[PDB]
Structure formats: C-alpha cells, structure tokens
Amino acid sequence: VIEKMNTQFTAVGKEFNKLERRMENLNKKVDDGFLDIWTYNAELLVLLENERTLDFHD
Amino acid sequence: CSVAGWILGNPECELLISKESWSYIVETPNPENGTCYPGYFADYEELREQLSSV
Amino acid sequence: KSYVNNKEKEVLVLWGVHHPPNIGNQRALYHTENAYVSVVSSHYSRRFTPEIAKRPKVRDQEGRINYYWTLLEPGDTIIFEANGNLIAPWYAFALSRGFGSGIITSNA
Amino acid sequence: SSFERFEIFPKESSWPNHTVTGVSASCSHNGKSSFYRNLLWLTGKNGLYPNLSKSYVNNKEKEVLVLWGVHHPPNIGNQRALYHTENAYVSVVSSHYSRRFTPEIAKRPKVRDQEGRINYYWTLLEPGDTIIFEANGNLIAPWYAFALSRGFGSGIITSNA
C-alpha cells in the first residue's frame, strides 16, 4: 500500500485573471478530478485489503 | 505585501529587500501593499508562476 | 540605455509606463504629447505609448502606471528607449532556480 | 441564474447633441432596416460629432455587464459622413479596466452584404465602481446593461429537443 501511493504531485495553485475564467475552470476541473480519483482509489484499496486481510487470518 | 509589492519594491515592503533566499513564499489572504501607484500589472499571474521556482 | 547580462543567471527586469490623467500633466512632466517607450532584446520587442483619459480615482490618484517585465537570458542585451513616460528600471533580480518551492497563502 | 436588463444611458435623455437613430439593412426586422436592441449607434448631428463623455456608477449590489462596440467603416467617405473626423478614438475605463480603440479603414469582403465591421466589447463593472466612456466617433454606445445575479448548477447546452 505504501509503495503504490507515491506522491510526486504538485498542488501549489495558480492565479488567473478576470478574462481567464475558462482556464481557471479547466485547472479546477483537473485538480478536482484527480482528487476524486485518488480518494476513490485510496478508499477502495483500503476496504478491499481489510476484507482480504480478515479472510486471510480466518 | 503582495508579490507585486515585493518585486516592484514598495515603501512599506522595505523589510523584504535584504532577504535573498528562501524555502517557500508566504502571502497573506488579502495583502494590501501591492501596486501603490494604481495601474495594470502585465502578466502578473505569469510572473507569480516564474517566481514560484526561484 | 542598455544592459548586457554578464551574469550566468537570468535577469528579471521590471519597468513601467506612465499614463497621465490629462494633457497638462503630460506637458508638465515629459514636455511632449507624443511619447513612446520601446523595449527590445534579442527575443523581445514591445512598444508602448501613453494614453490620456478621464479615470475613476484609485487610491486618490487619477492616472495610471502599467508594469511590465521580461527575463533577460545570460549573454543577451536589453535596450530601453523613450521620449517620455518611462518609469525606469533601477534594480533587477539575478535569479537562481531550484525545485520544490512555491507560493502559499496563509496567516499562520 | 438571472439578471435585470436596465437602461444605463436612456436613448432620449443621454445624448441630446448626437443622432441616436441609425439602422442597417443587415439587421433588418420585418422588412425595415433596424439595429441591436441593447446598443445605440451614435452619429453626428447637424454636421458635428461633439466630444463625448459619459459615466455610470454601479449603484446596484450586483455586477453589471456592460457591452459596447466600435465601428470600422469600409472607407474614408463613410467615416467623414458619419463622425466627421478621420482621427477618432474610443476610450473606456473603470478602476480595473482600460482600453483604447481606434477605427480601422480597409477594403473587406462583404459579410451579410455589408462591407465594414462593428467589433463588440464588454466588461463587468463591480458594485461601487464607475465606468467612463469617451469618444470622437465610431462608438456604438451601450444603452442597456445587465445587473447579474449568479447561482450554481446552470449552464449552456446545445440541443434541438
């Protein structure tokens, strides 16, 4: 679990102008999409491994 | 100070002119000491990106 | 004026252009109604002219200074020419880049 | 999610020394020449186009969307006929906006049987600020503007359902 979740991601934000709203929203979409995906992967990996771990011990 | 204040220099940002190296830059939520003489700062956002690797 | 970047580092050069609130101010400060500012380097070229307009006051000041900048590569030359309205560069920064830093917003 | 469409510069009272009547064949409505409903094409009156200066203070709690345009005649004769100057400019400023426009005269392909062009520009005026319009000619003045009210979840879709 530790080895797979290797973070090389940079989350430092960017500023945009009043006329760069399309770019701002694209940047927001990218950050939110990656966050949703990694949240999904982290939670799913932990639930599946917890279930397999308990079966292993039994 | 805003980033613009720091780089252009600002009479009230004098305490920053002597600091040449850092690990990161910390800006407050609503800086006031920016462009004291009003105007448009061209490519400001782009400069902030350039200064984020300095 | 010109400057040759004789450093191994990139140099950040900042300058501005003044845009007076009126003709009387343009005549009082630069003594021309037809000013221009021209800044060039081997890979940069921009020409600016002042604009005169009635403007809302900001910080009790009518009139504006626009700010501009460029990164001068090692070995290149930046040339500044003007008839007026130039807020000249005085100091500049010889930059040294690294990794992992960034700008964050915090009141901690 | 919504907006108030309101006059900033009412047609009748705002420009007493300019002609506020002007239409084009290309905006024809029910067979008659017409024009944009939220804009006014200002032209000279009695041979003159007096230097124009107008302003609006956003006294609403809402952001105001202001639209205007700049006319670029097909030739010199048209520039002289409408504005009576060959050196026109349009200048629009606010505390956080500044743009100066000049007309361009050129031979152009016809589009909608019209040679010549109107460029359209806009800005959002923040509550409490002031927008100032100055011109020697070539200004298609704002008439109506929108006081915007923002919300969430809406968007623009393309559909023929």
Ligand SMILES: *[C@@H]1O[C@H](CO)[C@@H](O)[C@H](O)[C@H]1NC(C)=O
């Ligand atoms: C409206 O669209 C029709 C489409 O056939 C076109 O013929 C007409 O000229 C257009 N009118 C205006 C004012 O845009």
Ligand SMILES: *[C@@H]1O[C@H](CO)[C@@H](O)[C@H](O)[C@H]1NC(C)=O
């Ligand atoms: C002439 O036009 C200017 C346009 O800004 C207006 O302010 C002024 O009141 C007008 N005046 C007349 C007919 O006196």
